[PDB]
Amino acid sequence: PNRKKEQRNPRVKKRKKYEEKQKKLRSVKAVYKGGEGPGGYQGELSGIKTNLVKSVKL
Amino acid sequence: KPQKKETYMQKRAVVVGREERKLRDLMQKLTTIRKEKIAKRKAKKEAQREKLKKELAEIEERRREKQKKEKKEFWEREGKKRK
Amino acid sequence: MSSLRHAIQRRAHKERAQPLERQRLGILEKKKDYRLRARDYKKKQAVLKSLRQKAAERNEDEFYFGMMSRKGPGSALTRGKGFTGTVDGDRGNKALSVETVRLLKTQD
Amino acid sequence: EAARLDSELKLVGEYGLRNKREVWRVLLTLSKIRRAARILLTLDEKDPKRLFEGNALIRRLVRIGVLDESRMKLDYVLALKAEDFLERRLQTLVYKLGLAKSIHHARVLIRQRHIRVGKQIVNVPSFMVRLDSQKHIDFALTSPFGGGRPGRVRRKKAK
Amino acid sequence: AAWPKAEDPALVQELLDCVQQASHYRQLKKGANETTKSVNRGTSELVILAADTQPLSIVLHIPLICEEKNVPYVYVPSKVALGRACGVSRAVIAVSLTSNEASDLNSKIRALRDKVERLA
Amino acid sequence: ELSVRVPQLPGPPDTLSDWYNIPRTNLTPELKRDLQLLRMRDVVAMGKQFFKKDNRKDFVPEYCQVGTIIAGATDGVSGRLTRKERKRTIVEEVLSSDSVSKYKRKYHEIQEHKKSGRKGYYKKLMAARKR
Amino acid sequence: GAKAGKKVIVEPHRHKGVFVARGGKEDLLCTANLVPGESVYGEKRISVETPTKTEYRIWNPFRSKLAAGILGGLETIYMKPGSKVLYLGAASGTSVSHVADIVGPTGAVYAVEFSHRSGRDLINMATRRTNVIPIVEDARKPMAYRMLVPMVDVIFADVAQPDQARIVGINARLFLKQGGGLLISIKASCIDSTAPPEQVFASEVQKLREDKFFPKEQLTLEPYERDHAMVSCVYLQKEFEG
Amino acid sequence: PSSMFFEHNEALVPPYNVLVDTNFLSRTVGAKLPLLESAMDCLYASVN
């Protein structure tokens, strides 16, 4: 059965799967990613839902 | 049934303005793309949900297999003791 | 299994198009399109059948309050050329009484 | 052991290694070191064996700069780990010293033999570095970054 | 005025040493305007301020912003020697260093800011 | 010092006491339009942004005020709208911006794919038949 | 940027007093400022012609960790408009002004700061805003401003000190109502700067539970200022107010 | 939980905190083993 570049180098395949998983991580939790913008603050650039609590209740 | 007469309301309606018309056209096309995008995403979400429930029933079948093996192990190891 | 199958083994097939001596009479209903036409015809005919049960098991002396506040279908007998047995309603507008009409006229 | 899976993957991805062979190998090294650390704690404090052997091992580790010059005790000798051994792994130094834009580009550079440490060019990216040497890492003279010939692509483009 | 001054006994020397480390390691902003921009971007990990300066008011306003951001600062006694430590060919009165979260340089900086926090 | 008083005896609240007097929102059509825009703000940023899925069955809050972004003292060179750029309604602003071309193109596309084969196609088949 | 001049809409958020203003391609957070029309620090602001006296202020997260918390969606931030709040770590007063605009006139916030000239900015704002009380002293010795602080309900803390837990603990011992509340914020790099941050947070919360606190919320202000946290606890009861 | 990754805890680095449960404590006395020593050896790091 025929295969791909991505399979044929087992150096590359753990690069992309590491990239996409890190992209996959960028769905669930929140990464830091630098400070506010160097031009400045520009709002919460993708919305605010009010009624959502994300606090671990101890 | 749709009207073939022409009411005083429809005649007394005002012709709308030009800025208003541009605005309303924008609003129309906005709602269209909104509805179709919600349709695509709802469809994909439904297909992945059906996929996942298939794997849940598969793990249910495996649960029943281990249930069968375990209960038969219990009662075979139990029958000779009562024997 | 699912690695006991060769590549050209899973190479599956490709539909056969409508012949081009014919195409002015419509696309070729292969299997899936037949299934679609079926299921539509099926749910429609079962709706039709259930309605037929209702219309053979009406009772003539029902009584509601809608019948005090809608028109009735009736028949061709009293309705005319223009009769399906729909029960109409309003379209939305009523007899709009005179004083407000004067107000409208002044504004216009 | 999905935790084993994801943990090993994050090791490689943060330092773009090649396989869980190399990662497990460095882990084996760490295991031998922490075995030494366990033993030298098993001998009680102020014992002479403990004093000299632990002083030795701590000098070893700070000589390769993995355990910090700040903290010099057997507690931290236990507390070291694979991220630190990877920190003193070599290719990481090219990336953190600003010659190769990416860890993979650094891997390719080490392949085609453009960096050296001291004198000799290096081909193995898992050549462990030393604290005393780690700043003496630059391009060789034969590489077009360091000079020498402009390279084969410049050669052909001039052709 | 410059009451969180760094004392002599080689504490300033470990400071200048880590400055040399970060200046090679590109984790460094140099000059007071760069310091203000780094601390007002919040990337700053620590900032060192000279006290040997033609009037001190510059390295008095900079502590106002680092007090406004709750990130540490420390007074070296020598603008010339700090500039030489950075490798500028010019005296510098204010040098700041940021964070890069995969090293042991960060452990060094943690030690240094622990030192200055015990100084304060 | 003491006089005769006045007797003055002749629903849901109107200005919320615990949010510093936010009045009940008047239902005006341009306000409705702005509300629809801010709900459907996803498709507005076509391709480049995504938004938190704010999803209630209604969308009209009971209390809202239309306002103005005043001024940037630290920055007003380009974070300031030009005089032509200033708009009355948010909908007219997002109108007067660019990319409404790409909007219209997507519109013709979706319109065609919902006019795939539903009735016009059947009529033209019927013409190919009856001919 | 949501540039200067864009017509926007503002609505209440969940919390009593704070507001959220949505618009166009970018929403944000605001507060009705008590002191009218005037900016503090080049913060952007918002005017609405009410059917003059109606002005709001945009609240940068990255400048103010309370705002980071309001974006992180806290359980209950304990500060109703009209409440007594001891602030702690009141450096240069920006966030403090925001809390002031929350509590309004019928509230009062006690702004304590350690250094001087950040104090100067703070007391300038204390002249202007008629509900925030300037206190410039050593936080470690709260008997100094024992003359000033009455019993209050809500404790803000944002200092970065090793003895922070004991600081806010004795301040809880002195200035917090029965069934009190507090928000504090914590940096791993200033509590102990080699360890993993979650472990540092557990150490600090266990400390407060030894200070007889009831831990009742935690979050990590994750996309905004790395490895910090906001922690919410209640003073000496399981419920908040009474 | 922050400091976590795709079912891996980046958090727990040495030293390790270990909770004793009751069956475990009964059974490790019943097997006559030194608590701190055996844990330190099996983990190869410092605990409490």
Swiss-Prot record, chain C:
Primary site of residence: nucleus
Keywords: Nucleus, Ribonucleoprotein, Ribosome biogenesis, rRNA processing
UniProt feature, compositional bias: Basic and acidic residues: 15-24
A GO term from the CC aspect: small-subunit processome
Location relative to the cell: Nucleus, Nucleolus
Region (Disordered): 1-24
UniProt GO BP: rRNA processing
Family the entry assigns: Belongs to the UTP11 family.
Complex and partners: Component of the ribosomal small subunit (SSU) processome composed of at least 40 protein subunits and snoRNA U3. Interacts with snoRNA U3.
Function per UniProt: Involved in nucleolar processing of pre-18S ribosomal RNA.
Stated name of the protein: U3 small nucleolar RNA-associated protein 11
Taxonomic source organism: Chaetomium thermophilum (strain DSM 1495 / CBS 144.50 / IMI 039719)
Residues of the full protein shown: 1 to 108 of 270
